[PDB]
């Protein structure tokens, strides 16, 4: 699963989370087996 998101929201990409990204954009199951990988991409995604 992959997307670009605002850096302050990355905390929401986990089981049991709440907020606009977790509620309306993309929700992990609360027993998620997997890895969440993210990086600040301001040198390429900013425009």
């Amino acid at each position: 699963d992959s997307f670009v998101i605002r850096g302050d929201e990355v905390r929401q990409i986990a089981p049991g989370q709440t907020g606009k990204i977790a509620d309306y954009n993309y929700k992990l199951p609360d027993d998620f087996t997997g890895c969440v990988i993210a990086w600040n991409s301001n040198n390429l995604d900013s425009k």
Binding site: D8, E9, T18, G19, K20
Partner: protein, 50 residues
């Protein structure tokens, strides 16, 4: 206020919508120690102190 003379406001006789607080992404932490911030809107309290 200063941290040595820290300010207390008693909060009373009202509705309070904690979602209006929790939705504000400016809050770099919102750690809660005997309640979860999602649940607050379904509770009612005998006093609140800020």
């Amino acid at each position: 206020a200063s941290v040595y003379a820290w300010n207390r406001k008693r909060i009373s006789n009202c509705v309070a919508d904690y979602s209006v607080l929790y939705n504000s992404a400016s809050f770099s932490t919102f750690k809660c120690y005997g309640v979860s911030p999602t649940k607050l809107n379904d509770l009612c309290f005998t006093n609140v102190y800020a």
